């Protein structure tokens, strides 16, 4: 029953974005079957089916626009017809919750530990900045959680709609730029240690972090500007989302650039970096910090991959296609999986610490060692 109801709405969207009568008719045929497949409830479905036949008659005559109008009136009838969340949305909620609790407490503890050594050790500066980016990202989670609980209703305003869903993308660019800087530092410690003795100081590390943060912000603005709220009417609510309407080329362009700058180019460059570093290390007779950073780097690509795959696929698909509709329903889940980046670092630090007393003292040993 609940599955047939989604069949109706899915084909309803198909009609809304239909190019000809053939697609309208095909969609309407599937709606009829789904409606009949699904005494007071019988009447409602009966009114629905008749309206489908009305629209179906118009589409059979070849009148596409008139048939689509009759299909829009079908939505008015739907309101007269068990508001449970989709499976992917529910999993997103579970993940969101865990990431929030672990990420807020975990990264707050990291910031605490590394703040003290931040002017004494370069590594503390690196790990501090990664934690701050992860903590800040987690702050959006309660509001994202709430909106999904309220079936995507967004009562927080336009400003929050632009900012809060953007913090995960900010986290993407900030994390990977910081990791790029950390990786450059690791590379130089191993292959150009004379550079490190002449240059490497807390001052340069803080400047590199400033630039990394700044660049991340600039990379986030374009998508930030394309977020809008949208008011719905059946059932009435307010949605928060992205708007590349009448600009399918830009949607595709954004998706591709995000794939390259946010995933592919870092994957290439950091894998080269650590191939150099690991083969050097393994051919000779500091691994603690190195092992931690590799883990954090690895976890970045593991948890962003589904986001990136679904993102690219949707951009190359028509919005009326079954595969697009399926991927759309998975969007929140994919972002929730990406959000695991914002709680995974403290988990990594504690596990790496286990292989070495209290929790803050354990983080100190792992995160504030000097080279």
């Amino acid at each position: 029953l609940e599955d047939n109801w989604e069949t109706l709405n899915d084909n309803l969207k198909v009609i809304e974005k239909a190019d000809n009568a053939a697609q309208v008719k095909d969609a309407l045929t599937k709606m009829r079957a789904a409606a009949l497949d699904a005494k007071d409830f019988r009447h409602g479905f009966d009114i629905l089916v008749g309206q489908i036949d009305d629209a179906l008659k118009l589409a059979n005559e070849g009148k596409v626009k008139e048939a689509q109008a009759a299909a829009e009136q079908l939505k008015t009838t739907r309101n007269a017809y068990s508001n449970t969340l989709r499976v992917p949305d529910i999993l997103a909620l579970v993940i969101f919750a865990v990431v929030f609790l672990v990420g807020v407490l975990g990264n707050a503890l990291v910031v605490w530990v590394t703040a003290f050594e931040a002017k004494r050790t370069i590594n503390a500066i690196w790990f501090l900045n990664l934690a701050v980016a992860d903590f800040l990202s987690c702050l959006a989670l309660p509001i994202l959680f709430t909106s999904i609980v309220q079936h995507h209703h967004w009562p927080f305003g336009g400003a929050a709609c632009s900012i809060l869903p953007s913090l995960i993308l900010l986290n993407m660019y900030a994390s990977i730029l910081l990791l790029a800087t950390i990786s450059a530092d690791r590379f130089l410690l191993v292959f150009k240690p004379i550079w490190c003795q002449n240059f490497r100081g807390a001052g340069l590390a803080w400047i590199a972090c400033a630039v990394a943060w700044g660049l991340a912000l600039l990379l986030t603005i374009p998508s930030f500007l394309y977020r809008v709220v949208r008011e719905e009417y059946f059932p009435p609510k307010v949605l928060c989302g992205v708007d590349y309407s009448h600009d399918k080329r830009r949607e595709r362009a954004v998706a591709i650039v995000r794939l390259v700058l946010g995933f592919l180019w870092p994957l290439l460059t950091l894998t080269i970096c650590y191939t150099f570093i690991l083969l050097r290390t393994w051919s000779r007779r500091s691994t603690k910090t190195l092992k931690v950073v590799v883990a954090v780097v690895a976890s970045f690509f593991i948890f962003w991959l589904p986001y990136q795959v679904t993102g690219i696929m949707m951009s190359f698909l028509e919005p009326s296609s079954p595969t697009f509709l399926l991927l759309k329903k998975l969007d929140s889940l994919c972002v929730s999986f990406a959000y695991i980046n914002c709680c995974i670092n403290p988990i990594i630090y504690v596990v790496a610490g286990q292989g070495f007393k209290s929790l803050p003292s354990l983080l100190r040993n792992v995160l504030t060692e000097e080279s």
Binding site: R230, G241, S245, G311, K328, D331, V335
Partner: peptide, 6 residues
């Protein structure tokens, strides 16, 4: 238009 992220 598309709610959420994509």
């Amino acid at each position: 238009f598309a709610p959420x992220w994509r």
